[PDB]
Design a protein around this ligand. Structure first.
Ligand code: HEM
Ligand SMILES: CC(C)CCC[C@@H](C)[C@H]1CC[C@@]2(C=C3CC3)C3=CC[C@@H]4C(C)(C)[C@@H](O)CC[C@]4(C)[C@@H]3CC[C@]12C
Length: 448
């Protein structure tokens, strides 16, 4: 069959890795502009990286089985985090099983107590750190602090939170996060050398696990003296059992807890800031009025129904904030067998990617790509892929957006915000999970 257009390689060894790095969006919009096609092949460090940059072919991307499009190979730099035997660090059936297990800690009945819990936290942080009529803050830093706090309140029990504060967790995670080298996807050999990083990525892991056991020991003491059949993310997973017959190990239960925190953490905190920044912006005044009238009606303490049902615009602010500036720029799969996309064939051994950033800016599907409109809809289907799609579709959106939409209803119901910048902050494209620049996120919270 035919092959997509190969993009001209100026620098032999590297490819367009440095170009890609400087202006991912720019570089990419350029690659699709100069070949009359949204299905091109850039060369990263010598590995063919075919980007499916046309929304009308997204399913082509997400629907294939792991057998045809498999992410274990491409996302293997992540293994140290999860530990061995968890997710992509384990056979697909096992990951699936573990996915099944996480999904069931986040069902609709689970959110019953999640709402007040989340709103409980956002009120402790708007009280201790926001006790003046006006003040200057770092919104990206703050949302982040609130998102890690809201997250843990929902997932972890009262006891585990004393033992493991929100501060001492953002640390343990971070220590693991920095020990990651995403470039290992194209420099695979990189995952075999003993980097000083991989060691630390594990020295931190062990410490969270030495706390889990010291917590699991106290819960079996409590139930016995005075019953504490306390249920949380940890209590639920610790009671899980594999179809194969065996229980789930402390090593794995701990591993999974990390897998979620990585996904959940920045991404949720960023989707908050972007949204808040967009909303507090004068140019979106009609989008502030729309928001405050949606929450205008609510009681002092929202419940599951208010947030899950009665906040369709807030979510539209979130979904669009992600659309305009998606925290995850590149979804990737390893091509197990030649597959078909557009009218071109994608060879085996080839690396297929589906960039949300690029697709989120297709003109046929998103006119005025840089205009933040919580009122807009995709003019091509499957066009919005902020939460991935198909086989590996995100199973935490409702929990992340649940967090995001709760802070908003809490924040804009008790404050006003301004930007110490004429314009919105620049998307700081240097980090693994992308949000706006941290320095350009100084804001002013005003009491009503
Ligand atoms: C707004 C914040 C979030 C965004 C933008 C986001 C985005 C994504 C994306 C794009 C994927 C697909 C990965 C790929 O295709 O390679 C994904 C997968 C996943 N997400 Fe999220 N996510 C968010 C929050 C969360 C949260 C809070 C959780 C759990 C607490 C979560 C759990 C997961 C899991 C378990 C997967 C893997 C599913 C699978 O491979 O079958 N996500 N997410
Ligand atoms: C089986 C259960 C117990 C645990 C599974 C959870 C994992 C599969 C999730 C948790 C974190 C996770 C999702 C994320 C939104 C961040 C993630 C983040 C880093 C990374 C990134 C940022 C380079 C991006 O570019 C592509 C997506 C990946 C490759 C990777 C995809 C799926 C995850 C690894």
């Amino acid at each position: 069959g035919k092959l997509p257009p190969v993009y001209p390689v100026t620098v032999p060894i590297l490819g367009h890795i440095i170009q890609f790095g400087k202006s991912p969006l720019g570089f990419m919009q350029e690659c699709k502009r100069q070949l009359k096609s949204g299905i091109f092949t850039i060369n990263i460090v010598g590995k063919r990286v075919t980007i499916v940059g046309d929304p009308h072919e997204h399913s082509r991307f997400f629907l294939p089985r792991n057998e045809v499009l498999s992410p274990r190979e491409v996302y293997s730099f992540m293994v140290p985090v999860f530990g061995e035997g968890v997710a992509y660090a384990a056979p697909y059936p096992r990951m699936r099983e573990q996915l099944n297990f996480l999904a069931e800690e986040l069902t609709i009945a689970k959110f019953q107590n999640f709402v007040p819990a989340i709103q409980h936290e956002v009120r402790k942080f708007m009280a201790a750190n926001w006790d003046k009529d006006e003040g200057e803050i770092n919104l990206l830093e703050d949302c982040s602090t609130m998102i890690i706090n809201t997250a843990c309140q929902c997932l972890f029990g009262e006891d585990l939170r004393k033992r493991l504060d929100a501060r001492r967790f953002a640390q343990l995670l971070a220590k693991m996060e920095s020990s990651l080298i995403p470039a290992a996807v194209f420099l695979p050999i990189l995952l075999k050398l003993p980097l000083p990083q991989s060691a630390r990525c594990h020295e931190a892991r062990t410490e969270l696990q030495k706390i889990l056991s010291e917590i699991i020991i106290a819960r079996k003491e409590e139930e016995v003296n005075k019953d504490s059949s306390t249920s949380d993310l940890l209590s639920g997973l610790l009671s899980a059992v594999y179809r194969d017959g065996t229980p789930m190990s402390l090593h794995e239960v701990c591993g999974m807890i990390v897998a979620a925190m990585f996904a959940g953490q920045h991404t949720s905190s960023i989707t908050t800031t972007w949204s808040m920044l967009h909303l507090m912006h004068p140019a979106n005044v009609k989008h502030l009025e729309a928001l405050r009238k949606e929450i205008e009606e609510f009681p002092a303490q929202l419940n599951y129904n208010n947030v899950m049902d009665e906040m369709p615009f807030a979510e539209r602010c979130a979904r669009e904030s992600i659309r305009r500036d998606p925290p995850l720029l590149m979804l990737m799969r390893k091509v197990m067998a030649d597959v078909k996309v557009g009218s071109y064939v994608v060879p085996k051994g080839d690396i297929i990617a589906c960039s949300p950033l690029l697709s989120h800016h297709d003109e046929e599907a998103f006119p005025e790509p840089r205009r933040w409109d919580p009122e807009r809809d995709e003019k091509v289907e499957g066009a919005f892929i902020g939460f991935g799609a198909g086989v590996h579709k995100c199973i935490g959106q409702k929990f992340g957006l649940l967090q995001v939409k709760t802070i908003l209803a809490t924040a804009f119901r008790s404050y006003d915000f301004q930007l110490l910048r004429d314009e919105v902050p620049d998307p700081d494209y240097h980090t693994m999970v992308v949000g706006p620049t941290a320095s350009q996120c100084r804001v002013k919270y005003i009491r009503r």
